[PDB]
Structure 1
């Protein structure tokens, strides 16, 4: 197929520099104009600058002139973006795109912080033995104490789709906390096995916790 693949998430001390990569599969970079878009968390889209990889000439927005540098090499067909003297103000998702009819890249997350990586701790949320002999039951999972972003929660290995809500993470002393709920009918629980599965890539940690009834 034809699509841009951007690089992985980054964790950097401030003042540090990064070099993000955007690959063109099934089409040639040299025939298009490529641009990069920045997006602060919860905020909107800022254009960083565009580039025509052929002649190597790039046009920036003055706000990024001394922070960003777009460079394109037609050989490996990869476009790049280098950020300098990182600061909290640069922690955001970066997008790669072509000036034509093609979907942009999935974007890259760059988290600038002194905080070291820390795997989450997932605690399973089982109810306190109350009348659960009613149509549908609501199970829960509370993932907390991890940094940086993002974690992933799925239910019963992605098979349980309908009824799940993973609420957005939130900082605390530089640590996140997130949680996910699922509504399985009363019958399936626990006549079947419902389990909360969470993957935090930044620490090569995955954790499975079996939602099981509370005792005595």
Structure 2
């Protein structure tokens, strides 16, 4: 299929440089004008540059001229973006795209920071003993004390889709805290089994904490 895959997310200390690799599949970049976009946490879309892989002449927005470098090789269609002297003002989601009707890349998150990577402790949120029998109940998972973004919280390995709510983690002393709830009928709980599964790639840690009554 005709689609682009960007590199994995990376954690970089301030000052260093990153080479992001956007791999296109199903077509050839030597015949497409590629460009990149920046997006700060909660902020807008910034145009970083543009490039024609064939010859290699790239145009940039003056703002990024001093740190962004669009480079592309046809040998493997892998477009690159080198970011020099990284500062916090760079921590953002960088997208890869082509100047045509083809969906952008999934974006590569570049988290510029000094904080060492830490695995999330997931805590099961079960009711403190209240008449739960009432149509449906609501239990949750509180994942906290982890860095860096992102993480993956799912209920019963994707089985539980409806009624799941995951909240955009919040920073604190450089650590994050995120939570998720699930509304399952009074029936499935606790006759059935329901547990959240949270995965944190950056630490190669995955975890299953069983939601059992107190």
Aligned counterparts of 1:123 and 1:4: Cα–Cα separation in 2: 36
In structure 2, the residue corresponding to 1:202 is in which secondary structure?
helix
After superposition, the C-alpha distances for 1:116-149 in whole angstroms (9 at most, x for unaligned) are 0000001100101111110010001000000000
Aligned counterparts of 1:123 and 1:102: Cα–Cα separation in 2: 41
Residues 1:152 and 2:152 aligned together: yes
What TM-score, normalized by structure 1, do the two folds share?
Answer: 0.98
In structure 1, the residue corresponding to 2:101 is in which secondary structure?
coil
1:20, distance to aligned residue in structure 2 (A): 0.2
Structure 1 residue runs without a partner (length 5+): none
1:25, distance to aligned residue in structure 2 (A): 0.2
In structure 2, the residue corresponding to 1:85 is in which secondary structure?
coil
Aligned counterparts of 1:156 and 1:100: Cα–Cα separation in 2: 39
Alpha-carbon RMSD: 0.4
What TM-score, normalized by structure 2, do the two folds share?
Answer: 0.99
1:195, distance to aligned residue in structure 2 (A): 0.4
After superposition, the C-alpha distances for 1:78-124 in whole angstroms (9 at most, x for unaligned) are 00000000000000000000000100000000001110000000110
1:44, distance to aligned residue in structure 2 (A): 0.6
**Length, aligned pairs only:** 214
Aligned counterparts of 1:56 and 1:42: Cα–Cα separation in 2: 32
In structure 2, the residue corresponding to 1:52 is in which secondary structure?
coil
In structure 1, the residue corresponding to 2:89 is in which secondary structure?
helix
Aligned counterparts of 2:141 and 2:110: Cα–Cα separation in 1: 27
1:71, distance to aligned residue in structure 2 (A): 0.1
In structure 2, the residue corresponding to 1:170 is in which secondary structure?
coil
Aligned counterparts of 1:5 and 1:40: Cα–Cα separation in 2: 20
In structure 2, the residue corresponding to 1:189 is in which secondary structure?
helix
Which residue is equivalent to 1:203? 203
1:55, distance to aligned residue in structure 2 (A): 1.0
Aligned counterparts of 2:55 and 2:114: Cα–Cα separation in 1: 39
Aligned counterparts of 1:101 and 1:114: Cα–Cα separation in 2: 39
In structure 1, the residue corresponding to 2:48 is in which secondary structure?
strand
Residues 1:36 and 2:44 aligned together: no
Q: Which has the higher strand share?
A: 1
